[PDB]
Amino acid sequence: QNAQALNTLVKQLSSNFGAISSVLNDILSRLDPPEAEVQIDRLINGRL
């Protein structure tokens, strides 16, 4: 059960939660702050 919990927590890191991508570098390298901030907001909510 402990192993399953940890594995699920790890696997939840690849979701998009509605953002364009699940990689922070792929977002920073393509956008200005005013929209990267929105994408980061969505990602932050999901991971929290």
Partner: protein, 48 residues
């Protein structure tokens, strides 16, 4: 991006000043002519 006498220079999902820092699989180019009032219809989610 630096050339003047351009009515519109607008990018969706990409920061224009960052375009020199990215690599792509391939690039398409689409060319045509329309009226001045019709230029707003060229947009994602736009209706016309």
């Amino acid at each position: 991006y630096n050339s003047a006498s351009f009515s519109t220079f607008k990018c969706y999902g990409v920061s224009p000043t960052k375009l020199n820092d990215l690599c792509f699989t391939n690039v398409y180019a689409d060319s045509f002519v329309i009226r001045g009032d019709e230029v707003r219809q060229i947009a994602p989610g736009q209706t016309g």
